[PDB]
C-alpha cells in the first residue's frame, strides 16, 4: 500500500526547529525534539501556532533526536549517543536518563507501553521503557530491501511510522513483525514549502499522531509548517522500483 497525503491543515512550525522528534500529546500540544548542536531542545509546542510553550534547551553537546511521550514522560534519544533522556513532560526537566542499544538515537515512538526506537538502520527497535532492554528488533524490509534510515517515528494505530531520512516518505511499519505495511509519500509537503520559498528546508521528519482527534501531523527539519495530513491510498499502479527509488533512495 502506498499513500499520498493531503494536507488538511498547515500549522506554523518553528522553521529553525531541526525536528528530530515529534510527539502529539493532547489538546493540540506537541512535543518536539530538535536536533543540531546548540539548538537541540525538547519543546512543548502549541500545535495551532507552532509556538514553543516550553523548552528544554539541551546541552550544546547534544543533538536532540527522537522523542516520544510515554506515561507523561518524554523519552528522547540523541544523535551519536546511546544515551536517552527522559523528561517530565510538564517541566521538560531531564528526570531520568536511559541508554538504548540501538546504533544511534534516531527516532522514538511508543505504543504506550514500549518504546520503539530507530537508529537510522532498518531496525525498528522495541525498547522496554523500564529496563531499556531491547524487546525486539524488527528488520524492516520492503521488497527485500532494508528500509534503512528509519528516522522520526510515530506509533499510529499499531503501526510505527517512520520517516525515512532524506526521503519524503514515511514507512508504515508493522509493530508486529516490522512488515512494511505501507509507504506514505509526502513529496508534496517539502515541494510546496520549497515552492513557497522555504528553499532550504531540510528533510521531512517528524510525525505526530493525535489519537484523540485522529490527526497525523508531519513536519520536517527547519520546516516552517507542520502539516496535518490525511493519507490517501494510491489506487493507481505505482511504477516498479518507485518506492525503492523515492523511499529507499535505491
Ligand X SMILES: *[C@@H]1O[C@H](CO)[C@@H](O[C@@H]2O[C@H](CO)[C@@H](O[C@@H]3O[C@H](CO)[C@@H](O)[C@H](O)[C@@H]3O)[C@H](O)[C@H]2NC(C)=O)[C@H](O[C@@H]2O[C@@H](C)[C@@H](O)[C@@H](O)[C@@H]2O)[C@H]1NC(C)=O
Contact region with ligand X (CB under 6 A), list: 1-9, 95-103, 111-119, 231-239: 95-103
Q: What are phi and psi of 147, to 5 degrees?
A: -95, 85
**Count of residues that interact with ligand X, criterion CB under 6 A:** 8
Sequence-distant (6+) residues with CB within 8 A of 193 are 201, 220, 223, 224, 225
- How many Å apart are CA 177 and CA 213, to the nearest integer? 27
CB of 191: closest distance to ligand X in angstroms? 38
Q: Specify which residues 48 forms β-bridges with.
A: none
Which member of 86, 180, 185, 207 binds Zn ion (CB under 5 A)? 207
**Binding at 143: pick from ligand X, Zn ion, none (beta carbon under 5-8 Å per type):** none
Residue 116 and residue 124 in contact, taking contact as beta carbons nearer than 8 Å: yes
Which member of 8, 80, 95, 233 binds ligand X (CB under 6 A)? 95
Assess 233 for contact with ligand X (CB under 6 A): no
Contact region with Zn ion (CB under 5 A), list: 16-24, 27-35, 97-105, 142-150: 16-24
Q: Which C-beta is closer to ligand X: that of 104 or that of 210? A: 104
Judged by DSSP in three states, 147 sits in coil
**Binding at 189: pick from ligand X, Zn ion, none (beta carbon under 5-8 Å per type):** none
**Count of residues that interact with Zn ion, criterion CB under 5 A:** 3
Contact region with ligand X (CB under 6 A), list: 94-102, 193-201, 209-217, 229-237: 94-102
229 is in an annotated binding site: no
Applying the rule CB under 6 A, the residues between 42 and 71 that interact with ligand X are: 59, 61
**Binding at 91: pick from Zn ion, ligand X, none (beta carbon under 5-8 Å per type):** none
Sequence-distant (6+) residues with CB within 8 A of 239 are none
Residue 168 and residue 187 in contact, taking contact as beta carbons nearer than 8 Å: yes
Residue 2 and residue 238 in contact, taking contact as beta carbons nearer than 8 Å: yes
How many separate helices (H) and strands (E) can be counted in the chain?
A: 2, 22
154 is in an annotated binding site: yes
Q: Specify which residues 154 forms β-bridges with.
A: 161
Print the binding letters for residues 148-167 with Zn ion: x by CB under 5 A, - otherwise. Answer: ------x-------------
53 is in an annotated binding site: no
Q: What are phi and psi of 201, to 5 degrees?
A: -55, 145
- How many Å apart are CA 119 and CA 19, to the nearest integer? 15
Annotated binding site for Zn(2+): 22, 152-154, 207
**Which positions lie near ligand X, rule CB under 6 A?**
59, 61, 83, 85, 94-97
Amino acid at each position: 500500500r502506498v499513500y499520498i497525503v493531503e494536507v488538511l491543515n498547515e500549522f506554523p512550525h518553528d522553521p529553525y526547529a531541526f525536528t528530530q522528534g515529534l510527539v502529539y500529546a493532547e489538546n493540540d500540544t506537541l512535543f518536539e525534539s530538535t536536533g543540531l548542536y546548540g539548538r537541540s531542545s525538547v519543546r512543548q509546542v502549541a500545535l495551532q501556532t507552532g509556538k514553543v510553550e516550553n523548552i528544554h534547551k539541551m546541552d550544546d553537546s547534544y543533538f536532540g533526536e527522537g522523542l516520544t511521550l510515554l506515561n507523561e514522560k518524554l523519552y528522547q534519544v540523541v544523535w551519536l549517543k546511546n544515551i536517552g533522556f527522559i523528561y517530565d513532560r510538564r517541566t521538560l526537566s531531564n528526570i531520568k536518563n536511559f541508554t538504548h542499544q540501538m546504533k544511534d538515537g534516531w527516532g522514538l515512538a511508543t505504543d504506550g507501553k514500549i518504546l520503539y526506537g530507530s537508529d537510522g538502520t532498518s531496525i525498528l527497535y522495541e525498547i522496554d521503557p523500564h529496563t531499556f532492554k531491547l524487546i525486539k528488533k524488527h528488520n524492516v524490509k520492503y521488497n527485500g530491501h532494508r528500509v534503512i534510515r528509519l528516522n522520526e517515528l510515530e506509533y499510529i494505530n499499531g503501526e510505527v511510522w517512520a520517516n525515512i531520512w532524506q526521503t519524503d516518505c514515511i514507512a508504515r511499519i508493522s509493530a508486529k513483525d516490522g512488515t512494511l505495511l505501507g509507504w506514505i509519500l509526502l513529496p508534496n509537503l517539502r515541494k510546496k514549502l520549497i515552492d513557497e520559498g522555504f528553499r532550504d528546508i531540510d528533510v521531512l521528519n517528524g510525525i505526530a499522531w493525535d489519537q484523540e482527534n485522529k490527526r497525523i501531523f508531519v513536519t520536517g527539519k527547519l520546516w516552517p509548517k507542520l502539516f496535518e495530513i490525511k493519507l490517501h491510498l494510491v489506487r493507481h499502479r505505482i511504477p516498479d522500483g518507485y518506492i525503492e527509488r523515492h523511499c529507499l533512495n535505491l
